[PDB]
Amino acid sequence: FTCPECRPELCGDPGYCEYGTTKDACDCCPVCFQGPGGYCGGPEDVFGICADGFACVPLVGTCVKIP
Amino acid sequence: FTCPECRPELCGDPGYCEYGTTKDACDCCPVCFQGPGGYCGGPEDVFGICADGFACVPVGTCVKIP
């Protein structure tokens, strides 16, 4: 899948989020940061996007802090 | 592609969901429904998931079903 045109108005809302905020893979809309040890990866990072200092690790993977 | 099994306790918090709660793509993590007019679908509904009585309308937008 390649991303069709974005419109800032359309985006839903993730609510407040503890670890950070960031845009969607094509960079269109904001979503929340996955915490440490929480689901991530998947097609289009649907399962999460790791907060800064953390990297998605598979066995789809999970957020773990790098050195 | 397909889903691996998961740890329920793991899945991150989705927040208070004005339109309601549903399950994962892998049927594991809880998720909030997209409201009316909000972004809808894409690969695996990554973009959104329209609430019962609401349909993806082209990617697409949730539009109330009469």
Q: Return the CATH number of the domain spanning residue range B1-66.
A: 4.10.40.20
Give kind and range of the element (H or E) at residue B56: strand B54-57
The experimental technique used to determine this model is: X-ray
> Measured between beta carbons, which residues in chain A are less than 8 angstroms from residue B47?
24
Q: What is the resolution of this structure in A?
A: 2.5
Please report, in angstroms and rounded to a whole number, the separation of the first and last CA atoms in chain B: 35
CA distance B26 to B8: 11
Quick one: DSSP state of residue A9?
Answer: T
Residues from A in contact with B at Cβ < 8 Å: 1, 3-4, 10-12, 14-17, 24-25, 29, 32, 34-35, 37-39, 42-48, 59-60, 62
Domain A1-67 has CATH 4.10.40.20: yes
Selected for mutation to probe chain A from B46, B54, B59 (highest A CB count within 10 Å) is: B46
Quick one: DSSP state of residue B45?
Answer: G
- Each domain of chain B, given as residue ranges in start order, spans 1-66
Find all residues with CB under 8 Å of A64, minimum gap 6, and list them: A36, A37, A54, A55, A57
> Minimal CA–CA distance to B45: which of B14, B19, B23?
B23
Quick one: DSSP state of residue B10?
Answer: G
